[PDB]
Amino acid sequence: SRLTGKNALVTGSSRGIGRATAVRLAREGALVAVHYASNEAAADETVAQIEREGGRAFPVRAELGVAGDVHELFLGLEQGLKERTGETTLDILVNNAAVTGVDGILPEDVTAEQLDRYYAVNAKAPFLLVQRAVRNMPDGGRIINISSGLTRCAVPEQVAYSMTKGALEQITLHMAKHLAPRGITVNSVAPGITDNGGAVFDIPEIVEQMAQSSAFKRVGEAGDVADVVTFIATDESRWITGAFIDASGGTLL
């Protein structure tokens, strides 16, 4: 129970790594805001798991990458926090939500609209969420940006996505220095291929190809990544800031 009395926001925690992260932060005692865009049933399933495991959570709906996104997220976040604690304190922000697609887009096919959508959700929104979140964050808080090993591993069909993770990691570098005087750490956690419950992970043949990317010759589980995020959210990571934390199962060898 390393996060008793702490409040956390995990963006995009209806599903996948974000769900696994929300679940683990709540097991440590955090009150978790389970954010999503449209899959309300999946968000409610994250919250239901947390409640059945004895923790506390609530859903927050906000489409990122559109005007008023940060506002809408913080309206729901602060209402839920205040109703449950009397305060709006935000100890932990995990920038996990993303436009993230198995399909990819080869470079010849990328559209300007796709560049904008990826940017808006995966780079711009995290930046503006950090800027808003720090207002509510006490000295000693945690900002965790979920990147990708593809910032270090060339994959043409993910160029547009990867640009935005490269921008995200700059948030980590420069905001770690900016926020160090407040004792707020800022770190990147970089997954490799991770089973998020998508259909592709039900096709054993493709799963076996994907598994070869890891030195362990298996795809990651959501909990493999979420366990690392959870550690970073704790007090014992205090001397880690501005870092790139490889949570890829040895993909970046």
Q: Which residues are catalytic?
A: 161
DSSP E strands in the chain: the ranges are 7-10, 31-36, 56-61, 92-95, 142-146, 185-191, 194-195, 220-221, 244-247
Amino acid, single-letter form, for residue 93 = L
Which pair of structure tokens corresponds to residue 17? Answer: 């790594």
Q: Are 26 and 84 in contact (CB under 8 A)?
A: no
Is residue 252 exposed (0-12), middle (13-18) or buried (19+ Cβ within 10 Å)? Answer: middle
Which residue is associated with the tokens 């683990």?
24
Amino acid, single-letter form, for residue 197 = G
The contact pattern for a second copy, residues 229-248, with x = CB under 8 A and - = no contact, is -xx----xxxxxxxx-xxxx
| CB of residue 198 to ligand NDP, shortest distance in Å | 6
The contact pattern for a second copy, residues 161-190, with x = CB under 8 A and - = no contact, is ------------x--xx--xx-x-------
Choose from ligand NDP, a second copy, none: what does 204 bind? Cβ within 5-8 Å by kind: none
Q: How far apart are CA 217 and CA 234, in angstroms?
A: 30
CA 73 to chain centre: 15
Asked whether residue 221 is marked as a ligand-binding residue, the answer is no
Q: Which is nearer to ligand NDP, 63 or 157 (CB)?
A: 63
| Binding-site annotation, residues | 12, 14-15, 17, 37-39, 63-64, 96, 98, 117, 161, 165, 194, 196
| Binding-site annotation, residues for NADP(+) | 12, 14-15, 17, 37-39, 63-64, 96, 98, 117, 161, 165, 194, 196
- For a second copy, the binding residues (CB under 8 A) are 173, 176-177, 180-181, 183, 215-217, 220, 224-225, 227-228, 230-231, 236-243, 245-250, 252-253
| Binding-site annotation, residues for NADPH | 12, 14-15, 17, 37-39, 63-64, 96, 117, 161, 165, 194, 196
